[PDB]
Amino acid sequence: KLKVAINGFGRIGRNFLRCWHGRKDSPLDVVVINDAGGVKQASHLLKYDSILGTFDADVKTAGDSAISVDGKVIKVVSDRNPVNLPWGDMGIDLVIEGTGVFVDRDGAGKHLQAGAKKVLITAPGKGDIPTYVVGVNEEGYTHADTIISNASCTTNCLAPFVKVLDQKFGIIKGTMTTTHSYTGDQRLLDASHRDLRRARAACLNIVPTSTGAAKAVALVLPNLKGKLNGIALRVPTPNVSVVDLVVQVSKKTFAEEVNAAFRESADNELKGILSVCDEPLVSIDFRCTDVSSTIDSSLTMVMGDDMVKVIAWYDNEWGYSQRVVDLADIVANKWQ
Amino acid sequence: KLKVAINGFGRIGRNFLRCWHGRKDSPLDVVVINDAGGVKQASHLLKYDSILGTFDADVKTAGDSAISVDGKVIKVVSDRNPVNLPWGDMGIDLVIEGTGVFVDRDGAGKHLQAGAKKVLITAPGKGDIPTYVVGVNEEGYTHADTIISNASCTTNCLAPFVKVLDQKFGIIKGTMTTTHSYTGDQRLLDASHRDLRRARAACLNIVPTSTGAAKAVALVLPNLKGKLNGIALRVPTPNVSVVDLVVQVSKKTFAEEVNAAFRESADNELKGILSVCDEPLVSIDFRCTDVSSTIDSSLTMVMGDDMVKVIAWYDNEWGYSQRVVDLADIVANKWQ
Amino acid sequence: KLKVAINGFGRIGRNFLRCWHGRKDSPLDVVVINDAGGVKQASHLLKYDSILGTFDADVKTAGDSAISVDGKVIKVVSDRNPVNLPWGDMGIDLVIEGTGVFVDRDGAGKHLQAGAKKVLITAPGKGDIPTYVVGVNEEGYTHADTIISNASCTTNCLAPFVKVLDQKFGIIKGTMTTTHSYTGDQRLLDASHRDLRRARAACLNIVPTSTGAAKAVALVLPNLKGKLNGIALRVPTPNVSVVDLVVQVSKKTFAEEVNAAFRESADNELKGILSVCDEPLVSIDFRCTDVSSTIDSSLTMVMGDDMVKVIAWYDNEWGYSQRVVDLADIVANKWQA
Amino acid sequence: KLKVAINGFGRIGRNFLRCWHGRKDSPLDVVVINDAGGVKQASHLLKYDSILGTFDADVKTAGDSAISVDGKVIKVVSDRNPVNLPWGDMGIDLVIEGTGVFVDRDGAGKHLQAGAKKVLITAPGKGDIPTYVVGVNEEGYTHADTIISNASCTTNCLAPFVKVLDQKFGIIKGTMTTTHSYTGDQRLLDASHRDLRRARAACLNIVPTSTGAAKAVALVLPNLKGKLNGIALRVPTPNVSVVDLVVQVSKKTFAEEVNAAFRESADNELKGILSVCDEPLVSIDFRCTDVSSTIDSSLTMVMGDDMVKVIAWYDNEWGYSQRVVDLADIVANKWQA
Ligand SMILES: NC(=O)C1=CN([C@@H]2O[C@H](COP(=O)(O)OP(=O)(O)OC[C@H]3O[C@@H](n4cnc5c(N)ncnc54)[C@H](OP(=O)(O)O)[C@@H]3O)[C@@H](O)[C@H]2O)C=CC1
Ligand SMILES: NC(=O)C1=CN([C@@H]2O[C@H](COP(=O)(O)OP(=O)(O)OC[C@H]3O[C@@H](n4cnc5c(N)ncnc54)[C@H](OP(=O)(O)O)[C@@H]3O)[C@@H](O)[C@H]2O)C=CC1
Numbered sequence A, B: 001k002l003k004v005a006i007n008g009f010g011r012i013g014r015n016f017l018r019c020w021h022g023r024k025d026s027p028l029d030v031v032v033i034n035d036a037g038g039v040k041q042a043s044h045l046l047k048y049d050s051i052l053g054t055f056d057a058d059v060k061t062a063g064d065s066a067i068s069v070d071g072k073v074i075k076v077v078s079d080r081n082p083v084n085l086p087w088g089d090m091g092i093d094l095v096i097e098g099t100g101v102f103v104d105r106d107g108a109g110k111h112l113q114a115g116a117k118k119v120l121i122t123a124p125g126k127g128d129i130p131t132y133v134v135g136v137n138e139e140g141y142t143h144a145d146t147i148i149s150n151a152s153c154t155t156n157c158l159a160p161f162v163k164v165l166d167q168k169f170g171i172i173k174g175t176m177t178t179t180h181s182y183t184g185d186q187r188l189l190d191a192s193h194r195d196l197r198r199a200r201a202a203c204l205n206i207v208p209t210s211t212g213a214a215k216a217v218a219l220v221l222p223n224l225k226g227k228l229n230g231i232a233l234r235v236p237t238p239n240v241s242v243v244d245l246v247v248q249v250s251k252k253t254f255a256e257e258v259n260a261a262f263r264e265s266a267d268n269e270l271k272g273i274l275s276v277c278d279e280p281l282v283s284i285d286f287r288c289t290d291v292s293s294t295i296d297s298s299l300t301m302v303m304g305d306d307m308v309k310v311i312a313w314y315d316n317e318w319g320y321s322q323r324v325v326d327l328a329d330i331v332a333n334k335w336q
Numbered sequence C, D: 001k002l003k004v005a006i007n008g009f010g011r012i013g014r015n016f017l018r019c020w021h022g023r024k025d026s027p028l029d030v031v032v033i034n035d036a037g038g039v040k041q042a043s044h045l046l047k048y049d050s051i052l053g054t055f056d057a058d059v060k061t062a063g064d065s066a067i068s069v070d071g072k073v074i075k076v077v078s079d080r081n082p083v084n085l086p087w088g089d090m091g092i093d094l095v096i097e098g099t100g101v102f103v104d105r106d107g108a109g110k111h112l113q114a115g116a117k118k119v120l121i122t123a124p125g126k127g128d129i130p131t132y133v134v135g136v137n138e139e140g141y142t143h144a145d146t147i148i149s150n151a152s153c154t155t156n157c158l159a160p161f162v163k164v165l166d167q168k169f170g171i172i173k174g175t176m177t178t179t180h181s182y183t184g185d186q187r188l189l190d191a192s193h194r195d196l197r198r199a200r201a202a203c204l205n206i207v208p209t210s211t212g213a214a215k216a217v218a219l220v221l222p223n224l225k226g227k228l229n230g231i232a233l234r235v236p237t238p239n240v241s242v243v244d245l246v247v248q249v250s251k252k253t254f255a256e257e258v259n260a261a262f263r264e265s266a267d268n269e270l271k272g273i274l275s276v277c278d279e280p281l282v283s284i285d286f287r288c289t290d291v292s293s294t295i296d297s298s299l300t301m302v303m304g305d306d307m308v309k310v311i312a313w314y315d316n317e318w319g320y321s322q323r324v325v326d327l328a329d330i331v332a333n334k335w336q337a
């Protein structure tokens, strides 16, 4: 019931399509896809995936202008410049901007120029762009918004439980470290990169790198402005990441009280977004989890009664993608 | 000038031998080695190493009771039970206990029974065993000690800079997380293990696990008793690890002041033990570093003036081994 | 029907249970497991798998003596010594031996001493033990065999299509190499091992190691006695392997014909055993394939009309386990004691 | 002596510089580098290497136009378009082309348009470009060749011992497979790529991919035209590869004899090019070996007296680079313009 266009059929673009496919009675209708790769490439890389495994659905080529998924057809275009896109011609209502290169208002606006009605950036938007994290501040959304951001994968894992920590105990200050799976932005072997660390062989190193999730939390949760900072450590795993948040709170507490606070939310206002796991699991066990963040309850610690340490897992590819579909769903429900 | 016996020719045992080999005018004399493996195995695995690379020295078999290194001969025995060892027969002064199974007083004492004069455990000693970290409290050592511990690799990285942080700013409370390279204690593929997490495929997961380094710091630095706790995250790298320490201090400070405090120590009382790196490096760049801990100066952060976050690198195998040689050197210099 | 006991709940042991669980109207009944690790461990590792993913079934501990899967309770014992197992007491018909330590008659025989009626080794048997490969020589099995072998994962991948090659082109001689994923027998980090190459860090090296798969093929395809040989190259992947076979055939041929020969068999004789893939895929795309061998068609080459090169993929864990289930199924159907 | 310019400071480009740096009394003088990434980047990546380790030399930036290694200053420029390079202005004699994008005459020719006197491609040339393999056909090079190719890392590993086999046993036909470490052309995570197999996550798969190494061997050893073929299997290791060759030889032989043949050549003809290792080693033990091919003796097999299987290791980065240095050395010694 809503014409959606996928701009950039990469990890997020493909995960998004498969996430959408699995939804029941979806308000969205993916009609077109744009990628620098060919049509035979789109179908091949959509059907076979080194992380999600083979797609359980009939995926084949539909000529040279489209692909087929369980019968349904989806147009396939290719144009590095968004302005030259048939968005208007097709009456595209929403464009899923997942190229990683059109994050500001100028770049992302080119979709609007091409005739698109609205755009959702699958990443933090630079400049003055409204960003939303489902379960944290999506209510602030309004159809009047033509360009919106769904933040980063890390921000979607952090915001949900930081919100609980702040409402229940009151965060004073804090730092975070995310031991993150490597991503396409890194190099397979030591090679040129503006970030001299991300330039190093990704499957061979623990790669420290900056993160904006810490400060970005303040966007969706104003009360946290200037209260958090952090860094990231990219490690040799292909997917699934973990956040290590340490905060000083105003109200004294203890490990199990903190955990119970998370469970209360997980069962109510954050059901489907936040989860608490009591099992002694490892990263691979969290692949394909729909929630944005899963607290490893047994790792929660409190030092000196007011320094809380929380460990939360998140499938950076799949989990975030479900959040993209959710935000897109909201756009379709609060339309015109 | 001191008969040393290597009990357990594993990662630490082999690294220790190669570390010792590189020392100039060493007070130590490695005369014997004991391992569950054969003689041809000891020489092969000593000469070829997937982490340290090929040993630059002539290593060959010396029959069925010894091996040869650059000409020098070293006896090779094999006996799972230490009591049945020719320590007394050879007049062994010090035994480098690196089997990982004789960590308490009963088990490690068996070396003394076999005729050994003293034992140095290359790991935290369980029970009432004096533990020392060079550069932190080695002065407390006395020849009267028959069984001593050199703590863990993590404790040797943490203690050095925690000592500086506490003397210069006064630690109130803190938590730590070590993103650690996998070790032999983990499983290559999901298999039986008392620790249900360490039981999972090590090259495929981020594996949370308990650590005693946090509490162990209190042994070598009494003032820290009950002030720190922490966890470990084993990741898919074969060697080199990193500590992420967050502490609340009494004296307000800022990132560069903290770094300068580390440099001051690195240049004086902690020269050779602690180091500060201003380069934007990654884990592989710290392999074979002799220091116990290297602060990544650009990652240092301070939140709200009294919450300090420090990131320090350490070669868990090689770096720790140099510390083993150092403690052994001390034992030889404060002998009888 | 058949009372089955699993001895050694490792990769194959757990892949076996899950393989069995997926079968419909199984003639087998897994009633007990001998896990050295314990009940909590058996339940946890069965539920969570780094390769197979989370078992889609309700798995929990049952008291301190068993576990349950979707309600079916399975007893759990722990004795490293087979002779002390309550096999006779429980009336165990078939013991699935997947410890990797009781691969010879004296070892496996211990299960018989404990009362089990028959033992099936999930690996090449050592010595005079009959070995079978489903799709190649299973018909040779008889209820009289007290100790059988299901061969290795490599033999199960090779034998099937080698059989097609031989009967269709006549194999004169040949050699093969398997680029194999690492396994529990290798070392995570450089450490003691009888095989000085397997002693080296598995996730960091290309590790050459001997293989009996080539010779083992003669045990199931007598016609190829002393005609094949080869080695293995253990590489840094957790599961799924690939065999590279180069044979000199009597009949001059060409790639397209060789592939066509495989397709015929795959569609008939070896349906469910051998497969042919025309897609340009990679190792991971073959995880959880039930067949024991999948020919990569586009890689088939023929040099000088008589030198054939074949590349076949195989899930050394899941595909092999499915075969162990099939062989056990034959033991049940051929039973009648 | 020879004014050398490095175009493309990638894995080979940097391995080259370090290889050159280790040489004594080199006839080459590296005076400029064209790095798209910049000066700080060229200096940093030259100093810190995830595979080679930290360069044991004082490496720093020099102003904003150059870098220096142990005091020797090397200019750095950045133009993705070769035609605009100051080659003529600097009087560059030889351009080391390691970008992987100017592998044909029209591409490499751009360096000549910019004033360089000669171009040496660190990869198979596309089209009518003469290609050489040090130890096999270097003597065929003449100063008249303006654009040459040093072939691929796989061709440099195969050719050398294939030459020994052919002249000592006569190769009738053959096929090979190289279990190759991944390279920058593969994708870190599933992503767009002309080669649908190379598009797949490199550290997570066994990736089959085509190779020209077999055919390329004919360019340096004419005698083997149309006699060999093969493929490549990219595996999860960062560096070092291994070639698996299976050939049918005219003269009946046996493993011990084949190995002995390699040792003779290694000790004479191909000393410093071919080597023979009797140790049971693994991939990592061959990092930084100067030879371009090391025969794993204990793995040599012969099936039916005429089917020979050879396994040879090679550091596709460092060994190849050392060869690029040698070929450049021949350009200098054979110069005289
Ligand atoms: N991976 C993850 O865990 C998450 C990523 N994100 C964000 O999503 C974005 C993309 O990331 P990710 O999918 O991971 O990375 P990928 O590189 O896998 O996806 C980016 C895609 O953009 C495509 N592309 C680039 N330019 C164009 C263009 N101009 N027109 C059409 N297609 C184009 C690229 O095609 P080609 O390959 O041909 O160059 C590539 O397929 C980034 O903003 C990232 O931060 C957010 C959450 C999670
Ligand atoms: N790796 C690292 O980063 C560090 C490890 N350590 C500590 O050092 C110890 C060993 O660790 P590590 O070297 O890493 O592990 P390894 O398993 O590589 O070394 C342990 C060795 O003990 C040998 N061994 C076991 N029992 C005996 C015995 N009874 N007699 C003779 N030899 C025996 C084992 O032989 P076999 O393999 O035949 O069973 C193995 O070679 C542990 O205490 C560990 O915590 C401390 C600092 C750093």
Ligand SMILES: NC(=O)C1=CN([C@@H]2O[C@H](COP(=O)(O)OP(=O)(O)OC[C@H]3O[C@@H](n4cnc5c(N)ncnc54)[C@H](OP(=O)(O)O)[C@@H]3O)[C@@H](O)[C@H]2O)C=CC1
Pocket: B191, B192, C007, C008, C009, C010, C011, C012, C013, C034, C035, C036, C037, C079, C080, C081, C082, C098, C099, C100, C101, C122, C123, C124, C152, C153, C183, C184, C185, C316, C317, C320
């Ligand atoms: N992995 C694969 O791809 C294939 C393996 N195989 C074969 O199957 C066998 C096992 O291999 P795999 O599962 O891979 O390896 P694992 O090591 O994962 O399994 C072996 C199991 O045997 C258990 N065990 C050892 N001794 C005993 C005992 N005495 N009593 C009870 N349990 C015991 C071990 O327990 P613990 O860990 O407590 O020591 C371990 O769980 C081998 O014969 C192997 O060659 C065949 C086909 C495929």
Ligand SMILES: NC(=O)C1=CN([C@@H]2O[C@H](COP(=O)(O)OP(=O)(O)OC[C@H]3O[C@@H](n4cnc5c(N)ncnc54)[C@H](OP(=O)(O)O)[C@@H]3O)[C@@H](O)[C@H]2O)C=CC1
Pocket: A191, A192, D007, D008, D009, D010, D011, D012, D013, D034, D035, D036, D037, D079, D080, D081, D082, D098, D099, D100, D101, D122, D123, D124, D152, D153, D183, D184, D185, D316, D317, D320
């Ligand atoms: N790696 C190995 O094992 C071997 C590789 N080779 C061959 O060498 C070549 C390069 O391979 P490799 O070093 O491995 O790969 P890399 O990608 O690491 O090196 C290629 C380099 O070319 C640079 N580059 C691209 N275009 C230009 C340009 N127009 N001007 C200046 N610099 C440019 C790239 O810069 P940037 O990253 O900024 O895009 C990159 O640094 C290929 O021909 C390859 O087949 C041969 C033997 C061995």
